[PDB]
Amino acid sequence: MFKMKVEDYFHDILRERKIHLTLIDPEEQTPEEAVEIARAAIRGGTDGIMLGGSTTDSSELDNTARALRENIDVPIILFPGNTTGVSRYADAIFFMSLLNSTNPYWEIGAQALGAATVKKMGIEALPMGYLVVEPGGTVGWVGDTKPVPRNKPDIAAAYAMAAEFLGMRLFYLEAGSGAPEHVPEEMIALVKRCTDQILIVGGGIRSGEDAARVAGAGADVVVTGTVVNVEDKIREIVEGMG
Amino acid sequence: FKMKVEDYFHDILRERKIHLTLIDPEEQTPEEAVEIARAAIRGGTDGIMLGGSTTDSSELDNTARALRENIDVPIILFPGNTTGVSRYADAIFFMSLLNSTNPYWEIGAQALGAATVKKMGIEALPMGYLVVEPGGTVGWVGDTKPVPRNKPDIAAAYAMAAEFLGMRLFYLEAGSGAPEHVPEEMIALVKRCTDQILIVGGGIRSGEDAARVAGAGADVVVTGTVVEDKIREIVEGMGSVL
Amino acid sequence: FKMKVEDYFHDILRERKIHLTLIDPEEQTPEEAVEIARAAIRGGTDGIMLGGSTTDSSELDNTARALRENIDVPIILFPGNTTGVSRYADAIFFMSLLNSTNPYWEIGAQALGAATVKKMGIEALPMGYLVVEPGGTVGWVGDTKPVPRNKPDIAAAYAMAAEFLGMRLFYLEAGSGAPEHVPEEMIALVKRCTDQILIVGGGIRSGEDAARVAGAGADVVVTGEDKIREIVEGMG
Amino acid sequence: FKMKVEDYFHDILRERKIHLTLIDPEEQTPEEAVEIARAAIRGGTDGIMLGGSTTDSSELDNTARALRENIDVPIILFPGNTTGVSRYADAIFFMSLLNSTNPYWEIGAQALGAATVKKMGIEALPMGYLVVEPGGTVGWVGDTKPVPRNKPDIAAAYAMAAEFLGMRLFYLEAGSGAPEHVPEEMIALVKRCTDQILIVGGGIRSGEDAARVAGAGADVVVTGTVEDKIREIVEGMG
Amino acid sequence: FKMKVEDYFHDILRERKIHLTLIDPEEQTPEEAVEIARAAIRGGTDGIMLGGSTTDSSELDNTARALRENIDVPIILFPGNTTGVSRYADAIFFMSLLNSTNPYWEIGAQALGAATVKKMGIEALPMGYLVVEPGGTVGWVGDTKPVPRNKPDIAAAYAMAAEFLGMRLFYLEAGSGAPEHVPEEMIALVKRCTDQILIVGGGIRSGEDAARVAGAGADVVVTGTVDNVEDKIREIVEGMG
Amino acid sequence: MFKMKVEDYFHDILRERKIHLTLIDPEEQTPEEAVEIARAAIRGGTDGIMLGGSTTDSSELDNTARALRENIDVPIILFPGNTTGVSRYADAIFFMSLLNSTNPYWEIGAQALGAATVKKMGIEALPMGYLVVEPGGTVGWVGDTKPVPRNKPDIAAAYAMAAEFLGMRLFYLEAGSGAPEHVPEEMIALVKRCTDQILIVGGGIRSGEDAARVAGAGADVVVTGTVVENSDNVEDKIREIVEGMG
């Protein structure tokens, strides 16, 4: 349960330091195990929990979101990969467009289908451009993307400027979960130079030095999974960001 | 409900045709949906289909549980996705939207929810789903090229292809609330070319609508609610043709 | 101009509704556009949209600088092809064609021109652009699936998604020279569902056309002598 | 060949893995194809697959007829286009190319050929066809998004989806001439997730390749004439 | 036939307009197709088009062999699948389905069939193929957005692009069985906008249909045999006169 | 300011030698500097100027083309990356279909959008198949292509024959601007063998050696930028490149 608005929470943090978010996949473990992962990451210094996977079991995301809501005090932010990934127990939702998908369903179609449910639940919705970078991982394939090549910083900055002009105040550079190498520092730095978006970067950020370089390159938010204890992994990532 | 839904279908089809009542879990409340279902059962329906609709998330699980505890016919998930899944249903129509041009509705959504369907042990009925002109909201949202009412050969060829891929049920869909149901000529040609269980839905309002559709060769007639009298006239219509 | 176009919109709407006049830079001449625009300001238009349906654009920057020098009304770019960006306009309808099947009109062209829009100082109005059936030519070139007129729920869904992604303006488009305007039931449902500046254009010829459209909930009416005087009073 | 091909498969899999020999009817004359097939059978192949990018179809019928008259293992059509259906075969892999972005290869070409498959008496085996990185020429022509080699979970999700749609055969395709066959990890997870007959092809040239692919959990190994070579491959599967 | 089909076309077009009779090899025996063609040629038809169908290749070569032996007008392939090429034809309409959303029908199948077309030495006529509303079965199977009957400038724009890409022939297709042939206004605007040999087919069932289509500016009218073939073809060719 | 048809001009040159064209982006310099760049390349022996890039600012394509039209005597050929890339002042346009895009807009859509403008300006239109080869560069990414793999020359040959049978008398093998490697020799040679198009090769050509291998493998037209950034360009590099081809 997080009363305050997540977006102002983000701005409060950013006047002193960078934000870390921990991504939890609801299928990958029980709600109770999710609570334990989340507590470990909070003891590691994480600033919030992103919740999202690939599930249509509505009760199952809800059981995780509700369990987290009753046991942690940092925001629960929905990060949906399907349209059913909206839960009333969460504090906010990254309402994103998959910008470099060639499939209209991932650009706007899923969003139109889910919009009414987001409105009726009254959950704070943060507008986000979502850009998959090479290699792109599972989301780059399932979302029918053309991953931005690592050597094309200019493509990423043009989509960010475009996305910002359309009103997406958050921008997410995604190398894909498990990516061997994280989003290049060259591309993070050019994007941050070109827009005033809250700049989010995820994928392949494993070590404290990975996080120092992503943070040093201009990322406002760093996103990581919990593959490794979990507390040590997160705290070392948080220390690298500092 | 206990026995297999597909076995129950074949047992009915020994004597007469099957009627199913489509309930959208967003058009009413779980308890209002229970009375509608009881009204349809009083009218002679053989099962409840559930049901659109993209709407909410928990609104589906709540309707399936309420109905399950108060009726004795099966509850069959009719996903307008394959992104619905409730544990309280007895079976799911596992459909491919055959004449979509978007691979996401052909196979992509089905793959994203296959693990959830496997995780629950819910009976999965393999179904080819074919949108017929005009096609309604699903034909537009599903990126379909609706089969023209004057091209029954196209419908038959898609039904034969679906059959050779293992889809034992085939669903001709005029669209919810369509002005005219699927033409009798097209129902009849599909039934001739194929051994599938042939399901027809969309715009079947009156007993005469139901008699023409069943007498053209439908094994299953799907209608919505728009009263026990209405469903009873439809069932009597289906029976006059025996 | 010397004012933000979006406040100028908000001021007008806390007491009335907005009309904008759409001029194609290639069909006129700079002066004939300065005249067709000035004759429109007499009929009571609140601003001039510049937009070329075709792909030609040699006369855009010349129509822009011309209009910039003789009118006090804002000049808003309504990009048709890609080039439709000039240093002399006061703002841009920076829009995504939401129901296109071509990603080039959803995001691609917007990415190509974004650095130029930012290099110049042009105020960017973030806008969702929905083509409504029958759609005219824009529905075709745009590779759209035009929204059916009897499905206002589909248009409302796209409007709500558009606003959750941060587009504060929403444009309902029937296509230039459409036989009808966007249906009133569709305008009203979208207006109920979002807080967007709701814009409606295409097929609005008469003061009577512009009364049902404005009366159904549109904040901005777009049309393309002073029969716009007839139109401006229809919105009263 | 008298017995239903699908039951033949199930009978073999009670005891060992199946090997199939892929022959392109356009890469040699019918008589040479009979020679190749009989040599593959002497090496222990269990069946002939007949397929390719067909351009002319009298060649497919002449090869299939020559094979039907001179061998005693089944002839299974593996059609590259709707062109590829001959009455002289015993069965057909009736397949959907699952990770194509083109409806024509997902269902369209299948719908165009269905009436012909029905009019012939030909046993139709329902099959999900999944192209894996790198994917060869079929991956590029088929407008596929090849499944990355490090994404076995994507393949398993497609196999499960195909299974729930009634496709009882599943074919993991690395592409003809692939430098590396389908990863063992990916074969293993598909096999653990579904009850399909699991078929793997592309880049399988040695007895060691075949041993890795069958040991990882393939039921059927497909190769194409790389008696000595087939024997080496079949014995690697042993 | 021995002479280039394309030169033959230009010869006729100096004097009058061209008629082609479309035969589908699947719907009769080759013997019967020779009789159909001979009857059509006794009507004023200028050539036989083979195609329209998507199945089996063996039947096409037999049909093309039989006609080449028994007629003196060109045999022109109008293929449906990348299979439908036979060495017994005088020419092929090498088409791109231009208003398909599917790359396979724009270039893909053409790239699969091209080496075969080159293997035979068959004259290939470069052709843009535009499906016009309603569009028939080809417009649905080919994943097209049919040009609306009331947007002739969209048709002209595609015809002008096809011309600039080298497609010297252009086919406006209303679809087999269309209730109305392509509109005269749309035929006329394409002809005014390009130098292409303009071909029009679908929904042309009477001498009056053919008169209005040819009169609106078509260079080639394509019809089927709408036994009584000779009389009917005669009605169509005289309608174009 | 080139009177004469550029395609004629091309066949006339290919009677004796191979053609080189210099690609200039109207956005990365002023019309004056562009003129200086072109005169530089021309003295090092280029046969024409291609105007390319993704044109943004409405008029400086027009301004660059007109400035070149008045000051040079080899053809100016538009190499457009999007709708606007058309101007009175060029002598010819490469009227291209992006053959291996999966998006109809890049295959025929943009072309039909711009066709009337081409005709209205009387600009000479050269019918061209355009084929993106791995890696493909920014053009192959914006154009939603499946780049042809460097080890699938038979795919490129099939597309070239298809495009020839469709009337595209010119064929462009494109590795992508900035590509680390030019199109493979093996693939250039097979395309040259299979068709009789004017065969143009561009992308990743940085040296006399590169241009020698590309021309020697079968290219009729070699396309490069200036490579050098400061001139130094007229030609030194271009002369090295034009001499490598001979």
Curated annotation (Swiss-Prot), chain E:
Cofactor(s) needed, names only, are: Mg(2+)
The record's Gene Ontology biological-process terms are:
glycerophospholipid biosynthetic process
What GO cellular-component annotations does this UniProt entry give? cytoplasm
Q: Which SUPFAM superfamilies match?
A: FMN-linked oxidoreductases (SSF51395)
Q: Which InterPro entries match?
A: GGGP/HepGP_synthase_I (IPR039074), GGGP/HepGP_synthase_sf (IPR038597), GGGP_HepGP_synthase (IPR008205), GGGP_synth (IPR010946)
Pathway named in the protein's UniProt entry: Membrane lipid metabolism; glycerophospholipid metabolism
Region forming the signal peptide: none
Q: Can you tell me which residues bind sn-glycerol 1-phosphate?
A: 171-177, 202-203, 224-225
Documented effect of changing residue 140 to A: Forms homodimers. Shows almost wild-type activity
Which sequence ranges form a coiled-coil region, renumbered to this chain? none
Swiss-Prot/TrEMBL keywords = Cytoplasm, Lipid biosynthesis, Lipid metabolism, Magnesium, Metal-binding, Phospholipid biosynthesis, Phospholipid metabolism, Transferase
Q: Which domain of life is it from?
A: Archaea
Per the record, what are the reactions this protein catalyses?
sn-glycerol 1-phosphate + (2E,6E,10E)-geranylgeranyl diphosphate = sn-3-O-(geranylgeranyl)glycerol 1-phosphate + diphosphate
Give the E.C. number(s).
2.5.1.41
Positions of Mg(2+) binding: 24, 53
Q: Which family does it belong to?
A: Belongs to the GGGP/HepGP synthase family. Group II subfamily.
What function is annotated for this protein?
Prenyltransferase that catalyzes the transfer of the geranylgeranyl moiety of geranylgeranyl diphosphate (GGPP) to the C3 hydroxyl of sn-glycerol-1-phosphate (G1P). This reaction is the first ether-bond-formation step in the biosynthesis of archaeal membrane lipids.
What quaternary arrangement does the UniProt entry report? Homotetramer. Homohexamer.
Mind telling me which HAMAP family this protein's record contains? Answer: GGGP_HepGP_synthase
Question: Under which name does UniProt file this protein?
Answer: Geranylgeranylglyceryl phosphate synthase
Q: Which organism is it from?
A: Methanothermobacter thermautotrophicus (strain ATCC 29096 / DSM 1053 / JCM 10044 / NBRC 100330 / Delta H) (Methanobacterium thermoautotrophicum)
